[PDB]
Amino acid sequence: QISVRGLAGVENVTELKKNFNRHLHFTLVKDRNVATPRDYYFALAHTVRDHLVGRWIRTQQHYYEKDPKRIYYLSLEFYMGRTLQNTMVNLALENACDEATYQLGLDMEELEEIEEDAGLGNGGLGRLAACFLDSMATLGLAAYGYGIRYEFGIFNQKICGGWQMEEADDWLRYGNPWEKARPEFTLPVHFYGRVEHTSQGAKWVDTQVVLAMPYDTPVPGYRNNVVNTMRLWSAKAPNDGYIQAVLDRNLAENISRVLYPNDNFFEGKELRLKQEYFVVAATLQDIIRRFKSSTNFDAFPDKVAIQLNDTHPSLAIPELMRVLVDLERLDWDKAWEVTVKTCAYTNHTVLPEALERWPVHLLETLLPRHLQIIYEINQRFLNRVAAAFPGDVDRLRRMSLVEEGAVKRINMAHLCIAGSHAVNGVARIHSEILKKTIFKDFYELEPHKFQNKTNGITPRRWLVLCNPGLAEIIAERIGEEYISDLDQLRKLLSYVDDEAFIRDVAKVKQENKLKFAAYLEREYKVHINPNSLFDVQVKRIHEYKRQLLNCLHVITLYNRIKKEPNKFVVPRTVMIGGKAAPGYHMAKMIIKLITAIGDVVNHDPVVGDRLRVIFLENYRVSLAEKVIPAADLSEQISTAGTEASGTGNMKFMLNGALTIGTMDGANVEMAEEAGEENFFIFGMRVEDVDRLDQRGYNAQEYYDRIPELRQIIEQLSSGFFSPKQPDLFKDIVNMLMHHDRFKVFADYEEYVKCQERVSALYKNPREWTRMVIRNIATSGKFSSDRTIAQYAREIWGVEPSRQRLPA
Amino acid sequence: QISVRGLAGVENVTELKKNFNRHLHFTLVKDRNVATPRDYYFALAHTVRDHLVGRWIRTQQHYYEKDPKRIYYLSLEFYMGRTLQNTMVNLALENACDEATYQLGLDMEELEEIEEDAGLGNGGLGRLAACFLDSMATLGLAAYGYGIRYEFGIFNQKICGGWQMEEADDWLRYGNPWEKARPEFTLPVHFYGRVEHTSQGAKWVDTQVVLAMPYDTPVPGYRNNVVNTMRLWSAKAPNDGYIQAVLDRNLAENISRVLYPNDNFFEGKELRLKQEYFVVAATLQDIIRRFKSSTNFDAFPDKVAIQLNDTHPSLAIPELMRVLVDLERLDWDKAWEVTVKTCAYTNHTVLPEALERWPVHLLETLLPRHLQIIYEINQRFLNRVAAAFPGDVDRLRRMSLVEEGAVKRINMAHLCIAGSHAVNGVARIHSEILKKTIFKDFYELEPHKFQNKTNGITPRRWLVLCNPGLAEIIAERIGEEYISDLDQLRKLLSYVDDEAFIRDVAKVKQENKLKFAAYLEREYKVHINPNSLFDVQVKRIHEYKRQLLNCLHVITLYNRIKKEPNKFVVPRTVMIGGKAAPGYHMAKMIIKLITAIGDVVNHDPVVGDRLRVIFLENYRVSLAEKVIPAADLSEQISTAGTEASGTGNMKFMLNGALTIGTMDGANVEMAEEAGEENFFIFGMRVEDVDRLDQRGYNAQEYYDRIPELRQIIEQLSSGFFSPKQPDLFKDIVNMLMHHDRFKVFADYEEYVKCQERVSALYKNPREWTRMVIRNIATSGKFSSDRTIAQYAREIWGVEPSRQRLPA
Numbered sequence A, B: 001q002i003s004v005r006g007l008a009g010v011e012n013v014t015e016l017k018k019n020f021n022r023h024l025h026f027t028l029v030k031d032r033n034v035a036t037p038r039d040y041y042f043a044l045a046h047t048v049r050d051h052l053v054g055r056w057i058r059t060q061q062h063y064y065e066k067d068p069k070r071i072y073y074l075s076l077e078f079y080m081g082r083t084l085q086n087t088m089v090n091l092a093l094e095n096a097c098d099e100a101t102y103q104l105g106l107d108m109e110e111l112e113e114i115e116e117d118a119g120l121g122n123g124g125l126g127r128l129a130a131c132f133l134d135s136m137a138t139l140g141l142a143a144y145g146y147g148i149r150y151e152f153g154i155f156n157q158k159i160c161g162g163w164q165m166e167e168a169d170d171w172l173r174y175g176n177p178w179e180k181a182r183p184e185f186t187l188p189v190h191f192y193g194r195v196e197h198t199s200q201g202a203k204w205v206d207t208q209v210v211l212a213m214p215y216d217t218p219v220p221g222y223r224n225n226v227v228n229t230m231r232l233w234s235a236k237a238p239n240d241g242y243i244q245a246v247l248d249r250n251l252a253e254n255i256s257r258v259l260y261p262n263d264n265f266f267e268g269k270e271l272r273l274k275q276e277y278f279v280v281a282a283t284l285q286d287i288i289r290r291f292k293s294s295t296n297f298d299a300f301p302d303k304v305a306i307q308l309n310d311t312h313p314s315l316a317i318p319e320l321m322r323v324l325v326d327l328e329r330l331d332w333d334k335a336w337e338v339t340v341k342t343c344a345y346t347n348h349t350v351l352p353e354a355l356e357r358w359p360v361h362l363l364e365t366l367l368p369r370h371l372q373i374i375y376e377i378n379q380r381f382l383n384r385v386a387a388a389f390p391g392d393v394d395r396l397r398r399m400s401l402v403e404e405g406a407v408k409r410i411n412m413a414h415l416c417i418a419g420s421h422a423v424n425g426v427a428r429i430h431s432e433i434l435k436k437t438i439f440k441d442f443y444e445l446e447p448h449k450f451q452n453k454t455n456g457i458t459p460r461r462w463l464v465l466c467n468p469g470l471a472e473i474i475a476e477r478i479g480e481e482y483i484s485d486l487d488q489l490r491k492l493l494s495y496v497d498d499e500a501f502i503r504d505v506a507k508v509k510q511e512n513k514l515k516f517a518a519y520l521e522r523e524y525k526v527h528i529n530p531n532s533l534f535d536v537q538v539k540r541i542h543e544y545k546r547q548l549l550n551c552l553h554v555i556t557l558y559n560r561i562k563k564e565p566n567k568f569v570v571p572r573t574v575m576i577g578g579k580a581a582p583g584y585h586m587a588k589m590i591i592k593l594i595t596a597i598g599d600v601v602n603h604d605p606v607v608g609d610r611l612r613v614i615f616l617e618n619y620r621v622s623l624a625e626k627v628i629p630a631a632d633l634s635e636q637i638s639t640a641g642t643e644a645s646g647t648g649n650m651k652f653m654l655n656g657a658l659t660i661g662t663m664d665g666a667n668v669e670m671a672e673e674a675g676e677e678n679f680f681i682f683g684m685r686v687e688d689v690d691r692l693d694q695r696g697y698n699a700q701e702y703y704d705r706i707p708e709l710r711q712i713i714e715q716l717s718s719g720f721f722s723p724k725q726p727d728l729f730k731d732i733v734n735m736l737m738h739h740d741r742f743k744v745f746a747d748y749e750e751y752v753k754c755q756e757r758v759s760a761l762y763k764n765p766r767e768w769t770r771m772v773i774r775n776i777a778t779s780g781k782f783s784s785d786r787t788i789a790q791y792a793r794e795i796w797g798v799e800p801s802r803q804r805l806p807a
């Protein structure tokens, strides 16, 4: 049907059809008379999987022959979403399968909707890991993703009476056709025990053993025949009154049961520590095994790179020391040199409550040897500090891996910097902030460790897969090469005054909005005007992300309409979506506020269809693929200095939404790439936030001087939005007024004014679209292919390659 | 190679080879260079499974079109063992696969050894269920096996320092290629709650829901293209702080976690009650669903038969009442008529400690509605009793489903008799004992309910599969028809004086012994003389089975050798094997005694290779398939009146061992079929046991009069067999002397004398073999095909059919 979706040759369609029928019969044990749509999805999924395996086996064979340096990406999160369409895209089978299933009388799109998301992540950091695997395969790097096969991923979000309810995400219920269990590669992991010192060094004894069983999932590169591996570990009890003993096997296996649903918040629970060691201990054994099948660990850093996605797998550092010192009998100094040269660390936040600071008594019980290695690391590190800054006793306590206080803690971030040859932030402004503030001391010691690697997104999932209409009209004009070289989108700048392109871009957006508006009614009974501006804020719910600022704007628009009902306003559909961590009370209250606003606004006859406020339930990867292409306005409104990067922002820019936001995270590089005139920037810069802090933030001041703001607060306090419980929102008002760490009021005036400028541009469709073209055309930098190429060259020491492997 | 194993046509071998290669590549994702023997087993298993599915789909289709009466076999145990070879046998693919794997350079037999047993049973009762499924498919009955998919089956038995150690049987670790998950057919099961009475009858409310997910395993008939279904239910939690809530899902799912390892012993644990209801509640919903897709439940008993394998699924009775009365709104009397006509009950023991007597307080909490239905059943039943035996108040309390006492209990056996149209024992003597003793009262009320159905074994697994050599020499002479008409073995009587046959029978036995002797050294480092008589007792360890009597004989032989070292004795290898329930202390002590005897006997240089005592570790189905063909003497020595049937006995008769035993269980019918002269019968009959009881059993008497017995006891008491702990066996001696319920001493003299007659026959190879021929030739009655044909005609009301379905 459309050209980017590949060829539907007669040989391929015929081959796919009979393989579909084979799997339905032999694999699913069904016939056409009893098969449900779910059986058809599986038959298609198995048929597509068949095309992967040949390439998968040869890719692993190739890496064995050639023996290149291997990249190990360690993450506790891999937010993969669905695999079927993505696999088709990267294999050029999309049209072929469309044809083949059409001829069998089935609608492929309907079948795609049946696949469960692999929601093995929380948000940005987990999805970054997913985009990265895609890009690594597309760039032909010998790269492995390592993590945990959670039985339950991020919870499904249900709204009941406007409240979030969490229900277990049981994504393996019907099975996962993509994974291959590899029980033969099972590995022991140790916990508890004690440390013995012998003549021949320390020994870790009396441990409890948990077995780690790997599952391999294929990661196909874009049309290059490269298929890399994602290896996820599952917890299994060893085989050594009776009934209870068997039932107690669940204790060991609980390790891989459930993903912790905190985003940007540290919770010091033991089960989470067990998860962190489990992935690290099994992964490192696997790495060393593969290394030995190529005595001399000098070459280890030439053959191995290990990337740490945040501090979650930071125990890789003392674990590698443990293995090298205790088991391989290398001397400390040589083992340490190997470790530093092998490991690299990526930071994703500067919020102090997000930093992992493990109580020493936990590490002592669970990992007594690792605590000893950490104390030894800390001591030798502090000796370097003392030697470089003699007499500076305060530097010593600031830089320590060990924090003193009520309870002693290990600062895992300090550990990562000391034990890594490179430390990076995830956007330029974030990388600068790390150097100026929380890691200043470390930067002064070792300036050469600190780098920037601005985040990116994969244009395969985030353009071709979710927005074929837009990919097609672009391909019509500039070809297909841009899909793996997103810089080529610049060529689109010479179409900015082209009447045909302007009409096509706008037509694609209209189609996406129509389709999404239909999806809203069919799956969630909600009535929206598709001619309105689609104003969307989707991301995890957090105070720093300031969904509350958005709420205040929405209430302002409503109050303005009610004040002058017969005045013309640009109509809007305001969509806010995202999950709150189950114990984050404030986040839960914000979700409730949003729905309460919708209850009032959406049922006011005076408002008409001019303003609708929708909360998007169960925001997740597959919902993102639908709403992002349909958006006109992307809300990226974090208080300056708090959002490390953002990647949602990039998804919107790539798909033809304009951005309203602060000079925060990657926003800064986006505006810089598109031109500030092509972006809606408002609010305090980082420096303004600092000035406000030194002086003191007094929210009363804004309440006293802005009548429109005062009215909103009075409405909140008095029960306008909660008529049956007048004081339902006292916590929110109280926080806004007395302890807002994120200065919602300080940005309010500028935000509202900037929002008027957006509405004005929207009234002029042609100029709106011309600005969109200028965004799409400069989004090339934000490809994860660029990001990974920089990781590869400046951290890992490997050259990317665009070259095909033989078919 | 051998004719009973089918054709190895060139088309088939070629087809099998490429399908093997297909599965290795696409299903296992391996190539010939990285594949282990385990990968090869799986590739073969998937290849064979492919031949089943076509037939499986058409068999289920056929039953839909024709709509015959359906048999539902409800059991908590299905002791299946391995599936690969059995599937090959029943499909006539054995030689073809042998050829095909040989050409790929693999040894099929080596690959077969890799398959884990499905040990979803304890012993006799579980294996009966397995033989039955085979026979039902072979007889073309529309029959379904229903049970529980235990995650862990019967424990693996390890011997350490001569003690039993139990380790978890993790049989699903590497996956099970035979099962098909059917998550789409998932069904809710209810527990706890309370009962509400409305205008419109009783309602069961506030229940906890556990989901039952079915797994279907194919059951192929013998060369008839019939493939029936075994459906095993798995426990799943429904999808509705947070972390703990998810971890607590294990509580619900523990229902199908582990098989209770008691044999002939009731343990009143709640988890076991949950298992019993779980299988019954999900199974009945499935039955009724299938019935409705053919309002009028009059026809229900014409379309449904439900067989209860012991009292374990007895809750089917009040559950069917519950569904019919509470949900379908039939009146009591009509529902009851339907229930009785639908249900039938098989008893497997008369030992009072084996009978299920559930505490009322358990049923009250867990199943409050079922308790009400039971009280109502009991009341109306006792009204029939009162009306038939007016004034007999003691009959009323004896026959009650409710037992009075310290704690009130439900007698589940009384429930089954009242709610079933037929009740059967499992051998003629056992069926008579039920009528004369424990169920006398019930027999006098309803004589027409009581039947006999003597047990059988399947000649497919128990001759063709495990003893191809013997099946072949038989086929040479009488053809192949006997495999599904085992009565034809009679034709072998005219070969009893045939010199060629005599030599062939004996040659096959010698080969089996050689092969098993090799297996002993290769897998368990033990040195045995293959010219010795193989004296084997394999079965669960239990006092009534009298492994202890066997021990006393063994010690006697040893004491006789030591007394006259230079006198000739027929050499023996004495093999005893079987698992003890983990909490059955006495059973555990008997295992220890056996090994201790081996420690003394096997290392005495005076004994030479004349007497060896081996304990066979981890006795299970696949070990039975090896040891049974190698046996010369089958030990079946239970105290008369205690062993309901036995089926091990039948396995030995079929495979050319002679039997030493008591007139107990099926032994009686075996001797009657072969002629008493062709059998080694000894000891008290049932009547003698009764006489001894009335008078009183005084073991001291035998100790005072039998010097050889006195010496053995003195050896036990004084530490001859336990030199480091002289009093290790005080419990055993004490039991033998003061509270032996099974009268070991009373049978001792006769047992030893009968054992001398065995040795004498063994000295004359030709006459030994002629007697063997007379056993094999009369074992036809003991085919499970005969058993199931009698169940079908006299209980279920369906005609068996030997006719092929189209290929």
Ligand SMILES: O=c1[nH]c(=O)n([C@@H]2O[C@H](CO)[C@@H](O)[C@@](O)(CO)[C@H]2O)cc1F
Residues within 6 Å of the ligand: A122, A123, A124, A125, A126, A128, A262, A263, A264, A265, A348, A349, A354, A426, A455, A643, A644, A645, A646, A647, A665
């Ligand atoms: O716990 C965390 N979880 C998480 O998803 N991020 C995110 O990591 C992303 C990837 O670097 C960034 O783009 C981000 O700025 C917005 O999601 C950042 O907040 C950062 C954390 F600290």
Ligand SMILES: O=c1[nH]c(=O)n([C@@H]2O[C@H](CO)[C@@H](O)[C@@](O)(CO)[C@H]2O)cc1F
Residues within 6 Å of the ligand: B122, B123, B124, B125, B126, B128, B262, B263, B264, B265, B348, B349, B354, B426, B455, B643, B644, B645, B646, B647, B665
């Ligand atoms: O709990 C039990 N488990 C069990 O396996 N059987 C057996 O059920 C078999 C099948 O009917 C019989 O042959 C038997 O006599 C010897 O195993 C009998 O003991 C009887 C029980 F009661």
